[PDB]
Amino acid sequence: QSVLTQPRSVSGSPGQSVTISCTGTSSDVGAYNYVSWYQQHPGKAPKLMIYDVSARPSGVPDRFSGSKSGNTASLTISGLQAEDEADYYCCSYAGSWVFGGGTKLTVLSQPKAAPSVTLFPPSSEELQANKATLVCLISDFYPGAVTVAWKADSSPVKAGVETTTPSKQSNNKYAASSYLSLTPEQWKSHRSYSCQVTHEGSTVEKTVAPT
Amino acid sequence: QVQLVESGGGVVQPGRSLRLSCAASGFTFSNYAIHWVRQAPGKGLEWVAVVSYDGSNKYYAESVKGRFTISRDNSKNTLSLQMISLRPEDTAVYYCASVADTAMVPEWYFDLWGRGTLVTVSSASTKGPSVFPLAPSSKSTSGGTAALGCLVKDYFPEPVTVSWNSGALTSGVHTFPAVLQSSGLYSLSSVVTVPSSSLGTQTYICNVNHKPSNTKVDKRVEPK
Amino acid sequence: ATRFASVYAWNRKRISNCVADYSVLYNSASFSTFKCYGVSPTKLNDLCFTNVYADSFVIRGDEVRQIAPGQTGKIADYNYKLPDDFTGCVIAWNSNNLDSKVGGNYNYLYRLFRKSNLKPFERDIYFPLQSYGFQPTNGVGYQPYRVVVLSFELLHAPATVCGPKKSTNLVKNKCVNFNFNGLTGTGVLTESNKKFLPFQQFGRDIADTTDAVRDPQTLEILDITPCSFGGVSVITPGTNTSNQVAVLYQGVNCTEV
Amino acid sequence: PLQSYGFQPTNGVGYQPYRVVVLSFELLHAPATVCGPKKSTNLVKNKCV
Amino acid sequence: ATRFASVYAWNRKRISNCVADYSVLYNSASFSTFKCYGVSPTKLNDLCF
Ligand SMILES: *[C@@H]1O[C@H](CO)[C@@H](O)[C@H](O)[C@H]1NC(C)=O
Ligand SMILES: *[C@@H]1O[C@H](CO)[C@@H](O)[C@H](O)[C@H]1NC(C)=O
Ligand SMILES: *[C@@H]1O[C@H](CO)[C@@H](O)[C@H](O)[C@H]1NC(C)=O
């Protein structure tokens, strides 16, 4: 409704086909036929690729294609090239322009790497300074898509979360970091805190203790 | 060349005002709608506003109404975006977004983009970092591999250079890029990977240098 | 309206029996052109009308040079034709979100091939039918424009279409400035001894003037007489006698001077 | 007295070049040798046509 | 013609001893404007010069 539902990342082999959903509502998608698709290179402006789900503008190659039924659009790019590796955005206009959640297409050029996670408790010198910062570190992973899930002994915590968008490290994999800022009274109240990552469906969990 | 050149960006404080603009060339600007679509760095897209040639029909978003005012001048082929009551969530790269002539694409879609300008609504000043030693856990699983570091927190602006043991410790060093929290400050992390049998003899010091604030804090990382 | 008709197959909305308001279409600045042929463009309010045909389609933008009556062109001899004695207004204005859209706009079609010319106000229903690509770093006259045709017919019938003016009580036996459905003129009005047929409106003389009308909201019939006039003539002796005068009115008696 | 124009397709329509050609006829005042694709019809005498 | 005459040195080519066919030149659409003075463009196929 407010933000159109997209997958956060879609991984695909080069030369193959991927299908990226744009899930909206009946007042957003099923009302009219005016749904767009926008390719945005990092460090540059977006670029139009699809109008009116069926057809393409001038200069757009025929690899871009769309399909819509009901309240879900579906961008289909056949024959993945390395120049398609960017951010993807769908937008609809019935009365207002509502964009999508964002989709990072990752053109696979090297085999899959699992993220190594090292979780650190906040220091005792920070706990004397009436502060606490949990340090969850992500490195050596490809394709570049992780989602950080904090946990308090069984339960997800979403407030006070600062996480870095994955940027390149030296050996063509990516690096990341996630911070959980808390009070020292919430640190010493529960039993254990966990930082769960999700990388292409794979979950690596690390757990520290206040002791 | 169909071309859109933004103007009016900068770094402002919360509670103040700013006025942006965009000049058009290469196309008849009086016959097609231009928009503002904002994008925070590393985040999604967000439309702002639209102005008509008669100056009557304007539509704003829900986080836009009552504060932002777009206008245009069809004679000079430029425009304006008057913005008051600025908040730090409005910090985004602002694009003047219109359509060119060659496309069948109408004005409510988005073909002809601008290069963008950055508007920063922040009250953070030149702050030195607080270096907090991330204490390792080698005392229980000694014999294998321990991870130690120091936490750099609450500084502004970029950059902070971190070296280990006056640059002598190089293997295992991987200093991470920073985060951008709600206060407008930054926080990085540097963790070196050490053998767990070397923490009882070797002292590990991270050298945190912040050159725009002249802050050099040498903090030791000792096991608990 | 949401969607219009093509220049191939156009739309005819017959309009009768309502009160018009042309001025709100006139003063509103949302129009590229406004060309009223046969009728002065701001005098649209005062003349009251029989029938109104609202004719809407879309066209290549440079072909508004060819939309004029009598002007030849590939829309004129093949697609849409006006007579030489056309009266009325054609209004065209730009369409860059209105009729311009993607998908092409291939819902709207133009026929480029036909083996003859046309009859005016006709709708005809290689392969002759095409649809433009609307691309303006070529012609901005290669853009589609909202064109509309307000054809009129002058008064020979029960008039039923006019503007927002307010009528007034009538009078008799005094030379006034009348107005009936747009017919102006002066003179005096009286009751009619002449019986009247229940389908006409107008008594016309040999001398091509109006002597008999009926009130368009009252079935009484009035006779029109032009209010009296005459030649002015002066009787005098010579100026080398005096300066007293004598005034003579020709062909009308003294009760009205 | 002689100057040149720059003709890119980037410029507006008023600045584009336009190929223009003028067909100046001289009407018949002498034997005509230029006219359309029609076919003659055989003449007749002593009947109004 | 692939290369045209400038307006400074404009080309006058002459035409005679041929059958015209203007109708195919008219009836085709490649021309922004087609105006004739003292003569109507549909009628040229009738006259003979
Ligand atoms: C119009 O005027 C006539 C007078 O003959 C009257 O009968 C009728 O009610 C009027 N209609 C209105 C005021 O709508
Ligand atoms: C006519 O006028 C002149 C000058 O006013 C005068 O001398 C003359 O006597 C007049 N004629 C008569 C018949 O009175
Ligand atoms: C004027 O018309 C006739 C002609 O002289 C006359 O008999 C009549 O009395 C006059 N009208 C009036 C109102 O006196």
Side-chain angles (χ1 to χ4, degrees):
Chain A
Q1 182 65 42
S2 66
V3 175
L4 297 178
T5 300
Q6 295 184 0
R8 296 180 184 271
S9 67
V10 171
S11 294
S13 295
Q16 296 293 321
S17 298
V18 291
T19 301
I20 298 169
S21 66
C22 182
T23 300
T25 62
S26 67
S27 297
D28 294 331
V29 176
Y32 292 172
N33 291 320
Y34 298 101
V35 179
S36 67
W37 287 94
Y38 292 146
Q39 174 174 358
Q40 183 178 3
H41 292 89
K44 289 173 71 175
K47 187 174 181 178
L48 172 54
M49 292 295 170
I50 291 295
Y51 54 79
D52 284 338
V53 186
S54 63
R56 294 178 290 109
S58 66
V60 173
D62 54 352
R63 295 184 291 115
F64 295 94
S65 65
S67 66
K68 184 178 75 173
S69 179
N71 291 321
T72 299
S74 297
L75 179 64
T76 300
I77 298 169
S78 66
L80 291 174
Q81 294 179 356
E83 293 85 4
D84 295 332
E85 185 174 0
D87 285 329
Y88 287 159
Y89 295 99
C90 62
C91 181
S92 178
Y93 174 70
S96 179
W97 291 269
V98 175
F99 291 101
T103 300
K104 176 71 174 177
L105 181 66
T106 302
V107 178
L108 276 75
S109 64
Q110 64 183 358
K112 184 175 73 176
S116 67
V117 178
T118 305
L119 182 61
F120 289 99
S123 67
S124 296
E125 292 86 5
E126 187 178 2
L127 293 174
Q128 295 295 321
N130 291 317
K131 290 182 180 180
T133 301
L134 278 77
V135 179
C136 184
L137 302 176
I138 307 167
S139 66
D140 292 333
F141 63 98
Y142 186 79
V146 293
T147 60
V148 177
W150 295 97
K151 187 173 75 177
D153 282 320
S154 294
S155 66
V157 177
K158 294 180 181 179
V161 178
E162 295 291 327
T163 305
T164 307
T165 302
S167 297
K168 297 181 70 66
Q169 69 179 1
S170 296
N171 56 5
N172 287 319
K173 300 177 182 69
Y174 292 168
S177 66
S178 179
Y179 290 161
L180 182 62
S181 296
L182 295 176
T183 64
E185 292 86 4
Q186 291 177 355
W187 176 256
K188 295 180 181 180
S189 65
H190 294 89
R191 293 180 180 175
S192 66
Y193 289 160
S194 294
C195 179
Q196 294 180 357
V197 300
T198 300
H199 184 273
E200 293 291 328
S202 297
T203 300
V204 175
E205 179 175 358
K206 297 293 182 181
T207 302
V208 296
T211 186
Chain B
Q1 178 64 40
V2 287
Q3 184 178 2
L4 297 175
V5 177
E6 287 86 2
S7 66
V11 175
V12 297
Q13 292 183 357
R16 292 181 180 178
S17 66
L18 187 61
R19 183 181 62 85
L20 276 79
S21 180
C22 179
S25 68
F27 70 102
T28 302
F29 179 68
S30 67
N31 287 322
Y32 294 101
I34 195 156
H35 304 276
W36 286 99
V37 174
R38 65 182 180 178
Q39 182 182 4
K43 293 182 183 179
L45 298 177
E46 184 175 0
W47 173 65
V48 178
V50 61
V51 61
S52 68
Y53 72 98
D54 55 353
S56 66
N57 298 115
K58 295 188 288 183
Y59 291 99
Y60 296 155
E62 294 294 326
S63 65
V64 173
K65 292 181 182 179
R67 293 185 292 116
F68 295 163
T69 300
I70 186 170
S71 69
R72 64 182 292 162
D73 194 2
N74 295 315
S75 297
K76 291 174 70 176
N77 290 318
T78 60
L79 58 98
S80 67
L81 180 60
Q82 183 64 41
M83 297 168 65
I84 66 169
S85 297
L86 297 172
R87 292 186 179 94
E89 70 268 14
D90 296 332
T91 300
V93 177
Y94 291 170
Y95 292 97
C96 60
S98 178
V99 67
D101 297 335
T102 65
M104 297 296 292
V105 174
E107 66 193 8
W108 65 83
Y109 286 101
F110 292 97
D111 181 73
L112 183 62
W113 289 90
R115 293 181 181 177
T117 184
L118 180 60
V119 172
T120 300
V121 184
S122 66
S123 66
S125 178
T126 303
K127 187 177 180 181
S130 295
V131 183
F132 289 156
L134 296 175
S137 297
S138 69
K139 63 184 180 181
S140 66
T141 60
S142 66
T145 302
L148 59 87
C150 61
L151 183 61
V152 177
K153 188 176 73 175
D154 287 330
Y155 66 95
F156 183 77
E158 186 179 3
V160 167
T161 63
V162 176
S163 67
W164 288 92
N165 290 318
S166 296
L169 182 63
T170 61
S171 179
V173 173
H174 190 190
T175 303
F176 290 157
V179 303
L180 180 58
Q181 64 181 358
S182 65
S183 296
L185 297 172
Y186 294 93
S187 296
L188 64 89
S189 294
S190 179
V191 168
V192 64
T193 300
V194 297
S196 67
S197 66
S198 66
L199 279 79
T201 60
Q202 185 62 255
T203 303
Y204 294 100
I205 303 169
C206 62
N207 298 115
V208 172
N209 191 1
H210 190 194
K211 292 182 180 181
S213 71
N214 291 319
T215 301
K216 291 183 181 181
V217 174
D218 291 330
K219 182 62 67 69
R220 295 181 182 178
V221 180
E222 294 293 327
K224 292 181 181 179
Chain C
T2 64
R3 295 294 93 191
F4 292 163
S6 69
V7 65
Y8 178 70
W10 55 277
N11 195 1
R12 187 176 179 86
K13 184 173 77 173
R14 181 174 178 177
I15 294 301
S16 66
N17 62 16
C18 57
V19 171
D21 194 359
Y22 293 150
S23 66
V24 295
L25 303 175
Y26 182 75
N27 57 7
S28 60
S30 65
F31 302 99
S32 300
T33 182
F34 183 80
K35 295 183 183 295
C36 289
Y37 293 156
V39 177
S40 182
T42 187
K43 296 291 185 182
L44 264 67
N45 288 322
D46 287 332
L47 293 176
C48 191
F49 290 150
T50 65
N51 51 353
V52 171
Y53 293 104
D55 299 330
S56 173
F57 61 97
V58 77
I59 201 64
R60 185 172 68 85
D62 285 328
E63 292 170 348
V64 305
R65 295 179 64 189
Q66 295 179 357
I67 204 64
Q71 183 61 255
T72 61
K74 299 296 188 292
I75 311 299
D77 59 0
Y78 291 154
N79 291 316
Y80 185 74
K81 181 67 175 177
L82 284 78
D84 54 351
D85 57 350
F86 178 78
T87 185
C89 306
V90 59
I91 302 168
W93 65 96
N94 197 358
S95 309
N96 282 319
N97 56 354
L98 298 181
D99 294 336
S100 302
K101 66 182 181 180
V102 272
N105 197 358
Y106 294 163
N107 300 112
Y108 296 100
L109 279 301
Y110 69 96
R111 177 178 289 181
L112 199 146
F113 288 161
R114 190 178 182 272
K115 297 181 179 181
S116 66
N117 295 322
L118 261 303
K119 184 260 295 178
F121 289 162
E122 197 276 337
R123 187 181 297 114
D124 195 2
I125 300 299
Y126 293 98
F127 184 70
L129 191 62
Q130 297 84 18
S131 181
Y132 290 111
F134 293 144
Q135 293 174 356
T137 61
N138 296 318
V140 71
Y142 291 176
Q143 291 180 355
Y145 291 165
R146 282 186 175 180
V147 62
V148 69
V149 174
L150 293 177
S151 67
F152 296 105
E153 181 69 28
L154 272 300
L155 68 162
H156 67 282
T160 191
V161 174
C162 26
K165 275 70 57 190
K166 279 79 176 174
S167 292
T168 312
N169 192 4
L170 59 94
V171 82
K172 294 179 179 64
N173 297 112
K174 180 170 70 172
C175 181
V176 295
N177 195 359
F178 59 86
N179 193 1
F180 294 98
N181 298 320
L183 291 181
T184 184
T186 65
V188 73
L189 282 76
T190 187
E191 290 288 333
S192 296
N193 197 8
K194 293 182 180 180
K195 291 181 182 178
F196 184 72
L197 271 303
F199 63 96
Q200 292 184 356
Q201 284 177 342
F202 293 153
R204 289 185 292 111
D205 292 331
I206 304 296
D208 198 75
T209 186
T210 305
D211 64 348
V213 298
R214 186 180 64 189
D215 190 3
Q217 69 182 1
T218 307
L219 292 176
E220 62 186 1
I221 294 99
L222 294 174
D223 293 337
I224 290 95
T225 299
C227 59
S228 64
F229 62 95
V232 174
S233 58
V234 178
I235 301 171
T236 177
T239 56
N240 210 359
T241 60
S242 70
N243 296 119
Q244 294 179 357
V245 296
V247 178
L248 178 66
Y249 291 101
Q250 293 176 354
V252 59
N253 53 1
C254 294
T255 62
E256 291 181 354
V257 178
Chain D
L2 200 59
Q3 288 79 12
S4 180
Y5 284 136
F7 296 140
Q8 289 183 119
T10 66
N11 293 323
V13 64
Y15 275 70
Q16 292 164 18
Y18 299 73
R19 290 164 160 215
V20 64
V21 67
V22 179
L23 305 178
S24 54
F25 319 120
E26 185 16 8
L27 280 261
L28 73 168
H29 66 302
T33 192
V34 176
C35 62
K38 268 63 66 180
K39 285 79 190 184
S40 303
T41 302
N42 178 254
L43 54 81
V44 74
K45 317 190 196 302
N46 306 118
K47 177 170 65 175
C48 194
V49 293
Chain E
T2 50
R3 301 285 80 209
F4 274 14
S6 49
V7 65
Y8 162 77
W10 48 270
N11 192 357
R12 180 182 200 76
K13 189 173 80 178
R14 173 151 146 175
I15 303 296
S16 58
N17 64 7
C18 57
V19 165
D21 197 282
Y22 294 9
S23 75
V24 299
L25 305 177
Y26 189 123
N27 83 338
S28 67
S30 55
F31 302 110
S32 309
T33 178
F34 192 7
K35 294 186 193 283
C36 309
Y37 302 144
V39 176
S40 197
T42 191
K43 289 299 189 180
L44 283 72
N45 299 294
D46 291 331
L47 294 174
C48 204
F49 304 145

